[PDB]
Design a protein around this ligand. Sequence first.
Ligand code: HEM
Ligand code: HEM
Ligand SMILES: [Cl-]
Ligand SMILES: [Cl-]
Ligand code: NA
Ligand code: NA
Lengths: 713, 713
Amino acid sequence: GTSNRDWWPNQLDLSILHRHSSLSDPMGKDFNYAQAFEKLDLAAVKRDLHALMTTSQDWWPADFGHYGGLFIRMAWHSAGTYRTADGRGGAGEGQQRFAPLNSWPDNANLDKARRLLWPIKQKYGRAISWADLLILTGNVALESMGFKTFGFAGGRADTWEPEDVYWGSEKIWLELSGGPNSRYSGDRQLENPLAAVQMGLIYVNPEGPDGNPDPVAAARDIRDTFARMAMNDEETVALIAGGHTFGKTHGAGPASNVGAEPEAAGIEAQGLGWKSAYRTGKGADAITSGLEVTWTTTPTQWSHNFFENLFGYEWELTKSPAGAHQWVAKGADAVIPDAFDPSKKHRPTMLTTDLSLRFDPAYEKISRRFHENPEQFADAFARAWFKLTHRDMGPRARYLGPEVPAEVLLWQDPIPAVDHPLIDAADAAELKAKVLASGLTVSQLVSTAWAAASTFRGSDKRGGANGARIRLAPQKDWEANQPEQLAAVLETLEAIRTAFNGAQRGGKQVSLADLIVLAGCAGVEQAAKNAGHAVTVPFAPGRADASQEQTDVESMAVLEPVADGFRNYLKGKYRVPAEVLLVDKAQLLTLSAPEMTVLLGGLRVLGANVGQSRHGVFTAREQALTNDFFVNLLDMGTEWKPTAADADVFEGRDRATGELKWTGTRVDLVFGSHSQLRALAEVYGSADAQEKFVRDFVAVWNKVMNLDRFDLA
Amino acid sequence: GTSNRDWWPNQLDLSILHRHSSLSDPMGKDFNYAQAFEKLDLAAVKRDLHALMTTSQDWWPADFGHYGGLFIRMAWHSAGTYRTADGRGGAGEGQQRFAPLNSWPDNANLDKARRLLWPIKQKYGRAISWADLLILTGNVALESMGFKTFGFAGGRADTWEPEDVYWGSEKIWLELSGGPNSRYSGDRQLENPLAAVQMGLIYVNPEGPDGNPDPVAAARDIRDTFARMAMNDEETVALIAGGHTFGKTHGAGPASNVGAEPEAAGIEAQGLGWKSAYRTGKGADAITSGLEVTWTTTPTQWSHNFFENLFGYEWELTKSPAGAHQWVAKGADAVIPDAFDPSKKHRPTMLTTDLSLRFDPAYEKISRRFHENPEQFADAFARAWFKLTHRDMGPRARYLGPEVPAEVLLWQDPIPAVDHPLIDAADAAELKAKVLASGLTVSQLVSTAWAAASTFRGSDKRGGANGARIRLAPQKDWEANQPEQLAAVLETLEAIRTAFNGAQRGGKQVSLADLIVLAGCAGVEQAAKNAGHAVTVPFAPGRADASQEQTDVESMAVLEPVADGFRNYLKGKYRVPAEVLLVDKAQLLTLSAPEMTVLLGGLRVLGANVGQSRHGVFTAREQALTNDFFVNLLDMGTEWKPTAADADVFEGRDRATGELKWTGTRVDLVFGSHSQLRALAEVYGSADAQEKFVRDFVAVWNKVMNLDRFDLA
Ligand code: HEM
Ligand code: HEM
Ligand SMILES: [Cl-]
Ligand SMILES: [Cl-]
Ligand code: NA
Ligand code: NA
């Protein structure tokens, strides 16, 4: 069946803006997962998970009689798709159970792990999500094996279809670099937003870069990919050594024995894959990665044996039974237990990437410190495991249940508690009147609140207006935020705040975070008045101001917009057409196609463009809230052509006279070109639509202002 | 960006079940198009359209100063995608303005036609849909040129994204037959459900079959394609001759002058396409099909000059300026006017397909009759034009506005008016108790109501339980409906009806259509009671009973189910896997993936399978409404394998003992295989789900029972 995607493979794709439809969701529209979880007997779940650890099934027998290692890998893989570039991937939506991740080569036999959890999932139902269960099971496996976790939060709601994530352009699983769709260029530079070295891997190749077993060069890939998953050197070494304190790899025979991944298998496989023709196909005969390594002398118990072995032997390159590169300890005794036969023992072995922890000079110092001070190792691993598995959960207000750690961590972008009465409706009206009497314009008010609130992304629930981080490094210096203009707006708002607060009794005060948003609202109200309409913009107080010391400047840098079509901003020239980047931004903001359309049209006419560009400002009453953008964009009296200087800028000329009327970018004109977007523009550009446009704009504005308000949720 | 579709190109596609999401729709969730349309000043819209017909724009100058011909073609193309096999295509959703239809080669330059209508669309806004406007504009063009139309109904609500229709497998626009993706096999047999001879055409090739200019062979393709669009010989001749009474074709220069279709054009083209480098690129220089034919001496006025010319001359094969085959009248005077230069005149010309009307012997008799009696021609054309443009609108209750024809047509599957008081809630309870006391079983009641209601398709809004046509030819004899069993159920229900009706006062009575549905509701209530649950199934009376004389048996044939996964029924062996045919059926019934899942699971355990098959009946309490289907399907203690006799049947055996537990088809087992469907099955298979399962089943049952109840809209 030939599709639109076949005929027009480069056309913009809007279906990413309608994932999460209530059509695909089997739960009612009223279903609230937080409420269901808050009633779960989490202790009873943990008991059942503890019992499962040593209840082996014959269809996938447990190594050493304990599934703990398999479950820790399962949980680590669930979390470990996360990229800081866009916040996509991670454990927070339980995407491992959907395509493509359910069938990535690095997730081989994790299908079996998930199937082992079905009885517990079934027993507790909607009160524990898959997303939550995968992480909890990891935690319980650590606890069962003697490792004390830092804590656990529930609240990851299940999703019901695959997310549309760009995982790379390769058309071959695991393709080595330098191919026609290479994710690498120059001096081994991995393309943004990717955070893995080959298609279908979590981070790096365990044999070494493109299969070359050099631990020093592997270290480099490790450092790069883990950084792109938010982990520094200390966290990286704690995580790899911590994880590889447990379990084993599986490579008992050649990989050609292993069949179709889950999405390719026959219907009788009932959702599982990688069925193996090698001997029994499972347990002692299991093939997963092709490597055959067991790290420690007690694979089912926490120990300090990983670094004892790593440092205590010299290592020799060898091949697994499947042909994969790995390392064996020179002249060692057979001290490592077999997973199934008590009469067999094996020599200590390591992956190339394990040897990275010793042969990379910066890692070596941390590894040695961990070897000498195992308590520091244990604490760092517990902290990093918590971060890894919670990284995409958003503000602390979303964390549920009785095991949430009390300690506030820098990486959580923490927001101070509010400890004073909030402003009421009379106070809000007063503050808005002061904002308007100060001289701040519609365009300054709208631009500043947009800048503050539009850093939110729904992928990892970072960003937004709460915190007033727009006043701090690095947001106050971002080019998209117009630093000089921003400084002047914030100075006026700070004076308004200080005066209001000094005049109060009873300890009432307004935060700068709330005042930025409230001022934006006054600007939209003023804009509506300029167009002759009476409009009230909703506003919810309660934001607090975070400090500079609560704001990790390096972690904040990935939220910088390099493309924001809502302000007609592009920081440089890119591979990706500007309209593709607009739809990507709309997705992160959680907007539908109609919301994206109304929002952009209104922002153009309010003066939200960076640098006061005229591009797309298709109105003769700028700073008035009208549907002019749509009426003028759709006017057939105007003809459009790319400019000589720049093919991404267009001139719109009167068709009869030739006179220049407007200019726009690709972000502006795609609303007059794409057939679905132009259908949306037509609604808002019709003669009966002025009121609908205002209403719908105010709604989406308010939506964006509240994206991070999980304290109200 | 590599996608799931790239990695697993043959995996089932569920996204067809979630078009029409409220995410993509810009109108509020409360927007009711019928209400908006009913207040439109339709007379004022027709006046504006009338003025438009002679107001030429320089970007697309009007032939002969009159846009009427172009707008007729536009409206005919809007309707003429319709196929009777599935009811897909047609004008009823305004899909011509979306991909792919907006960019089909046969819709070349209809983008200009739609753009000419934007000012009127903009003026009237949401009170007239694009879908309605396209057809109305065709009508007004006919009227302005002296043709009396049969009427017009509004009510086609706009859609906001492309429908996913199978239009064929070719990867090249207009590919000639016999390629690697040939839509032809055998003795020129066109594959179901297609209704055109080449990808991107409306019906046939105007040069002749695969471009061979033989009018006799072309007649064959015409007859075949038109029949697949529900038009017999009489209607076909009326339509082609009627349309070709007006306007002209466009082929002033070689086709290689013409650029990118709209979906491939640059952004500056603002949604138009086919920009031409030939001379001015428009008007006198226009190129559309590459043919250059003007059929009549008054291309802007209704006449009987098409048949005068067809029969009054002999015809010679010739080539247009673009190289296309066409026909010119041997030795005729230049009597046909030029579209732009009053000083030029041309000879009469014809398409190969026009000559079909004369050289096919069956067409010739009709064409002669129409030539001799042009009043008969006019009436036939008006009736056919009404049918063509309304064929997918569904029951007469959906027809809006003041120009709806009063004559009831057999093709409308008409339903008699109700002229008596309806049963009330107490009556419905009494009738249900009588149905259950008669001895009819849960399985008979469910099966019979399913058979009656499930003929509905949302594509053209034909079918459903209204009318009680299940008791008539041909439905009563369809294999899926189990004719002997059906006859026995109907006999009992008719006696119940006769006794209830005879006992009433005051004219109150119950139709057999309503009693079939009500009995099915009693069966579902009894099934819930058998499982230990008291529920009431909603029921809305008001259906009526149509007669055999009001039922066109040949037109009803395309509604026969040859694949009904909901009854585990496949009438023969097909190309298409049975699970693909299930999702196709779900789409026609307007179900989401969750609705499809619940509905199938419930029907299995209620005994709805054809022939009392055990396949998928995964319960030991058949006729009780439980979630047993899902609990047993998902039980990992069972292992499944295809049988030796049949690869499409599977045995489910105890994993430990090998004992046979169940059998099922691909339709049953897909719910345990497909990653998104298994996630849905898990919800309904969980321990907390029995009440959700019953509630959701009752709701989808009721939805299916009411699919054709546009009387209650
Ligand atoms: C550079 C990073 C890493 C690489 C290249 C890597 C590679 C692998 C490979 C190839 C396996 C064998 C899969 C199999 O054949 O069954 C595996 C197993 C495992 N990894 Fe990692 N790993 C990495 C980091 C991690 C981290 C961060 C954790 C957890 C905190 C982790 C925990 C595990 C565990 C528990 C297993 C054993 C599974 C079992 O017993 O079935 N690894 N690792
Ligand atoms: C065998 C069936 C049909 C064939 C092959 C066919 C073919 C065509 C072709 C090739 C053109 C020229 C497109 C261009 O270059 O501008 C055209 C024009 C036209 N056709 Fe048809 N036609 C068919 C049936 C119909 C029917 C059923 C109607 C309406 C009842 C219709 C009405 C028209 C009109 C009005 C035009 C003139 C367009 C203008 O003036 O711009 N045709 N036809
Ligand atoms: Cl994601
Ligand atoms: Cl359709
Ligand atoms: Na994420
Ligand atoms: Na249709």
